[model samples]
Target: VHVAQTPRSATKESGETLTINCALRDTSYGLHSTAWYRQTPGQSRRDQLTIGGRYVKTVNKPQKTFSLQIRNLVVEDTATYTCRGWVGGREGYEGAGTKLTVKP
Candidate 1:
């Protein structure tokens, strides 16, 4: 299975909302779990971005896209986001990722 993330790069102003989408090919949501992870520049560790109400994940099977919506953008939210697809409790596919720049 392969996943593709849109908007290779994005620029947003503070307090604006942003959305990053991942296109799923040859994969089914029922058999896989997808999520977004963050990697800050100059940081060695990658962190799993927040989820749920504030940071929402929406799935649209018809479009074969799983997306992340982030609210209340801030400079701290600046990072590269990697989309991950999981299979059988193991990491399966990952997209090249999208870099976001949040400016004040």
Candidate 2:
């Protein structure tokens, strides 16, 4: 997984919206999909980006790139994003997570 931004990094205020992109250049050949996870200060893990979920707006099985968008962003929305990609019969690989700071 790889990430790149228009500004490299984002600095936004609370209650505003922002977006970050993630790309899986190669899946190591057997990975079925790439999922996104968010790690916050204190909270149950959440799936911020999903492909086949009810509120998801993207697909990961047959694609190499995707974006995660936050609307009406709040301070809690700030966190590190983990890109989890899997390969059958092997341990999954994750990229260097991204840290987002929602400010005011």
Candidate 3:
């Protein structure tokens, strides 16, 4: 499956909220599991949110696109993010990823 993300890089204040978006293209054939993950400089990626099989307003599909919101951001929130999709009973792959920078 082809996956994409927006705002390749973003910067925000420590006390603000951060929202990132991901899109799944050409998935009319079937539905898949979509999720967002975060990875620190020296740590493995971690699942932030899983987009269940539900109607997506932005993409107007059951699971075409999704977004994640992180509130009360801190310095630790600075990391790279990736969007992943699971298809055919296996996790497909992760997108290029987005860079998040938090300022104090």
In candidate 1, where is summed lDDT lowest over 10 consecutive residues?
A: 26-35
- Which candidate leads in TM-score? 1
Candidate 2: what lDDT? 0.58
Which residue pairs in candidate 1 collide?
none
**Candidate 2: how large is its RMSD?**
4.4
Provide C-alpha RMSD values for all models, in order.
2.2, 4.4, 4.7
TM-scores of the models, in the given order? 0.84, 0.60, 0.73
- On residues 23-78, what C-alpha lDDT tens digit does candidate 2 reach at each position? 55544454455567778768677565544422233435555555556666677767
Candidate 3 Cα lDDT to native: 0.68
lDDT of each: 0.81, 0.58, 0.68
Sorted by lDDT (best first), the order is 1, 3, 2
Model 3, which residues run further than 4 Å from truth? Answer: 44-63
Q: What stretches of model 1 exceed 4 Å from their correct place? A: 26-31, 61-63
How would you order the candidates by TM-score, starting with the best? Answer: 1, 3, 2
Candidate 3: the clashing residue pairs are: none
lDDT, candidate 2, residue 61?
53
